[PDB]
Amino acid sequence: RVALEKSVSQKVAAAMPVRAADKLAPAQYIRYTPSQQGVAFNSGAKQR
Amino acid sequence: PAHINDFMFEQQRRTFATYGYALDPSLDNHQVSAKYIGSVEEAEKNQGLTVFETGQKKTEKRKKFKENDASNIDGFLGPWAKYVDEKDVAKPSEEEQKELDEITAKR
Amino acid sequence: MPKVKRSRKAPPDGWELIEPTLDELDQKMREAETEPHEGKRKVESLWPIFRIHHQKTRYIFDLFYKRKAISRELYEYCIKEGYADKNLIAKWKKQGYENLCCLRCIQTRDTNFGTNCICRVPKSKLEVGRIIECTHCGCRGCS
Amino acid sequence: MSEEKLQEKARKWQQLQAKRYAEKRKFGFVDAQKEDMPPEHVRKIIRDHGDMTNRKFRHDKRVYLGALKYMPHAVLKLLENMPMPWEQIRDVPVLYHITGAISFVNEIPWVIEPVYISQWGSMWIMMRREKRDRRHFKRMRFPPFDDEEPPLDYADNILDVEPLEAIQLELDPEEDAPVLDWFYDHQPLRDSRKYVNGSTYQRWQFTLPMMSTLYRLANQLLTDLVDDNYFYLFDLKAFFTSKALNMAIPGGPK
Amino acid sequence: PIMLLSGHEGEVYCCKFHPNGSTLASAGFDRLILLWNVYGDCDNYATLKGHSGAVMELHYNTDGSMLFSASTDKTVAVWDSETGERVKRLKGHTSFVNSCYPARRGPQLVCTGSDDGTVKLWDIRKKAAIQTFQNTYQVLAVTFNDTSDQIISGGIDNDIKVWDLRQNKLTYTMRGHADSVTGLSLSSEGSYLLSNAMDNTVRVWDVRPFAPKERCVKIFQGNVHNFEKNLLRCSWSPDGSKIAAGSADRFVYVWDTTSRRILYKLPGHAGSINEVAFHPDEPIIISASSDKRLYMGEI
Amino acid sequence: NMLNLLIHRKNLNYLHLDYNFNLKPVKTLTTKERKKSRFGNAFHLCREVLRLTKLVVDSHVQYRLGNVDAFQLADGLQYIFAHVGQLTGMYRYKYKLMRQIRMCKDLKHLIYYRFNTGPVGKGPGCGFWAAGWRVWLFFMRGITPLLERWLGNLLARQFEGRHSKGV
Amino acid sequence: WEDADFPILCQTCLGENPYIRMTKEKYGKECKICARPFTVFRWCPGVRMRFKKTEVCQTCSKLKNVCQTCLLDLEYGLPIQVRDAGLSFKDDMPKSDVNKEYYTQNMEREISNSDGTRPVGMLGKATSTSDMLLKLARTTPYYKRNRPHICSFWVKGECKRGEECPYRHEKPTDPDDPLADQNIKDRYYGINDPVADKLLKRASTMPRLDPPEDKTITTLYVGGLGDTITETDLRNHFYQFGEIRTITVVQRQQCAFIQFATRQAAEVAAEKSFNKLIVNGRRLNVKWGR
Amino acid sequence: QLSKQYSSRDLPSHTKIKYRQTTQDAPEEVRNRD
């Protein structure tokens, strides 16, 4: 029921097309570990 | 998917932007210490001062004009006051000019 | 031909000494409004208007608050008829906001990260001497 | 450990903590507003874009087109505020797109009911006494402008002109004392918290002399019936029944 | 189970148990105090309201009958867990009151640490101040001594300070932490007191009638600080067996009083853990983190 | 500008819409263009609604320029609203309009035959334009969601393309 | 349409500050290769550097294993042609319109069944990084990539915007240079990209050990040995690589002469060690003795 | 690849599902019946 109806909701909200545009979700924060490690890159931090 | 606090990220970013050094963000499973990354010696000599934190700087601020009496018809520069140490025209000169003509012909 | 008046009420009677300044200012606004869209630019063709607008309301802001040289009634008539700018003024009266360039340079929703123009950053905390031209107003560091 | 160390430590941490927990970035604080632009901003944008033929724009082309989907809203919002013949000029709040693509009048015309009926009743009397006592009425021409006369500019043509007295009826100073001044305003008592709710303009409350003059002024557009047994078989229920039985009373619908 | 709780809009800074072990209180940036039932599905019944600033520290009484809660808006508040309603708004603090502590088993009395430069003693009934030891600067954590006659405080100058309620002078000053202390919690021994400090080291002390004059007892490694400088808080177990700490590293650190070994660095969180709560009855752990939710770990 | 941008985006250079929103060819068109350049009821309903509003705002511009009068403006507006049938030609594209059209006739017979009850004559000067105005406003309340749907479909089809795959 | 969690970009192109702020736009542009709409992420590289944008689909990236804007390889970081050649790969991605759209559709359907962890296909079967690839690799971030363009105005004199000229107000590069015109499509497909040819010529002129004439010259001269090495250490350099027959550690010249038992073994050892046999920090020079 | 086209017949309609009430024949009764 859950998965079914959520996909329903997206497909029918397509059939809304007049989208009652809701606000953009709050800014997310993502923590990123590059594969290439090296002190000369990222000014020497192993994360961004 | 991190979730961090908001004043602090912008504080660190502006620090690294205008001062050139920053409290490195690596949250490692090996316990590293607070290390100023980037211009490390600049962080050392400047005492870690942030662009947001007030600090003593005798740096010569560029000279500007100030015409803020709004009754002069062509007087008010107000907030739009130009910098006094600014140029009045921007152009390339005789050698680079002919060289750029030569390049635009070569292209 | 002036800002033809809607009130039909008589102007209170300081109106006669601030009349000519406002008149020449409106002359200048009409003129810099029509100034046609040359090879100038498309972002900067609207910088005159904000410039002039600030001026006019700044002027009245003087003659009521910093000189006290006009009455409450005349000042209110001059707002009501669109010479001054009610909220640009009511913002000027705040503490960090003496020289605010245009009222849109503090609109947080008009910018994607949710901030103010670099117009609004104190010149010291940048210290890099870099020319700032807030695309909105054309101002160079309002404060 | 060094004291001045700890002192600039207190300095730094004080400033930091102070800004970080400042009331500005408290939890539910919502940024204040969007206040008005100057009018010349709109005027200049729209007179600049002109008719999008100069390739200097050439990107507002796409948005200009895509905004067609909403122009039946702009038209409805525009026509529902037109200025009502006792007025010469009406100023309206306008919401617009920063490229001039569209311009919605952003307002709803609330009116006080007895005021409104009295104003239109005065119009009734004036129009009638005028059409009776004018020698020859000239009817304007439709369309008023030709097929290839481009539309006028506001700024160059109407901006500074004087606007030609409207259809006021001239109210008598004694009997119509309670209304003579605010009668023909756009929204009459908009800003007087004795008689109106506020500046959103709901909720009137009036004095009984006000109501009596208003009544007498709107007397022309009114029914001089006092009760309901005039509509005996002429109300909603009589019509519902007649319709249901497919029989039709003398002067009623079929 | 893991039992993660959510329903808080911003960071939760403080989470603690009923001293019954019956109900749960958590609080943080959202300027209100949420309550839950610890057992069953860990469900939410009540929400206390009113505090305009951020709830920086909530503190129970030792029965669980009234609630103390230090707010950013210069005020402490005591409320009725019976109702959830305000009985007292401890105003008069001249700045950010971060820390609060109700006297346990003594007369009803409160010590509050604040960002004004004073520690304040207050009686709940008088609506007036009792005593106030202006040392120089911000005090970031405050706890009584089980005699209710000394008061311990930790701030920016790294020397943990203790005042005698009767002579009103700096009774006991202890030293050895390299940077600012962020948390004090005296075990239920009435003797052993736990100190977190963002210099990455945690320490143990003991306030007694007679101590070796340099009472830096046990030392553990592991805690972290970063550009956040969030307030980091520690606790003893009900037994004085395990110390629990949080840090800006997303790792719940569980150590032991005995062997000082790392019994746990548990992951599971997304943002910095600000407060860990031990169940007064069970081996139940509740983590309040800056990821806008909580965890209910069972060990 | 919107309608002209539409016309010229479809690459129909042989047509032009003049300033009273009449659509006129500037050549004689072969079959291929007589076909390529047919338009729908969305385009034409939008055209005709804009023509009604231009008639109205231009009556007001005549008032404000000094050309007419307050009374001539009022009566000309009353005229406009009573005679939408003979001025726009909207009924061609949504024929349900005659509801409205017949209504604005019925009202006119009321008002007129109560306006001129005495010495007042059968002449032009009767502008009491509240009623017809109301009528066309309710019509617009009804039509805006319809036209927004039809125009959304037209614009989508013009920018994405028509879907001939799984019809 | 694609939908991603973050870009997938070179550290050079991602910037210098540890703390970056980046904007996403859903279905924002069209992949210049995949031809379909993508989500487009835009970040400010550094102070006074142009805002960069991801310019190729996430699938068009995972397929050839490159950085969505920098376009250079992910591990080594050379043009796509160079990496392909060094991996000896033969990438068969179609070129014409219909065949390419069809290939893209099925490759995307099959990459849907992945883990999002490593490139699909031979880019896993070709990760044996050859010393040529490691040798051509960039070492530190060539952050000259993110400075702004050349001001047509300031090249003609006109950039009257003061110091704010939207482009580097320097000399325009002579258009005759091969390193000027490299269309995106070719640089992704690897067909006649000038930077690839210049870098390949550079790799061909790079020093590698030379082979001798005679099969019987099975003594290999290693020059620059030093007296911190042992004969057993030279063994461990050339012991399991095959068999060594003899070892002469010349201490009067600080060199070595290794007689092997298999010609191919010694050849692989010495060529693979050419100037890069770094044992105890000594630059030995592997060559075939007299 | 979702279109913004639309249909007259895809407007919302009959947006609530009727459920079989207590007396009509609910799955409870038919679960019971003989």
Ligand SMILES: O=P(O)(O)O[C@H]1[C@@H](OP(=O)(O)O)[C@@H](OP(=O)(O)O)[C@@H](OP(=O)(O)O)[C@@H](OP(=O)(O)O)[C@H]1OP(=O)(O)O
């Ligand atoms: O042209 P219509 O829509 O039919 O309206 C007109 C008109 O009204 P306008 O004044 O707005 O043009 C006439 O009005 P008067 O001649 O009265 O001034 C007149 O109505 P009368 O019949 O009252 O003259 C005439 O009608 P007819 O052709 O029968 O005279 C007719 O209105 P109808 O709808 O009545 O035809």
Ligand SMILES: [Zn+2]
């Ligand atoms: Zn600005």
Ligand SMILES: [Zn+2]
């Ligand atoms: Zn501005």
Ligand SMILES: [Zn+2]
């Ligand atoms: Zn400004």
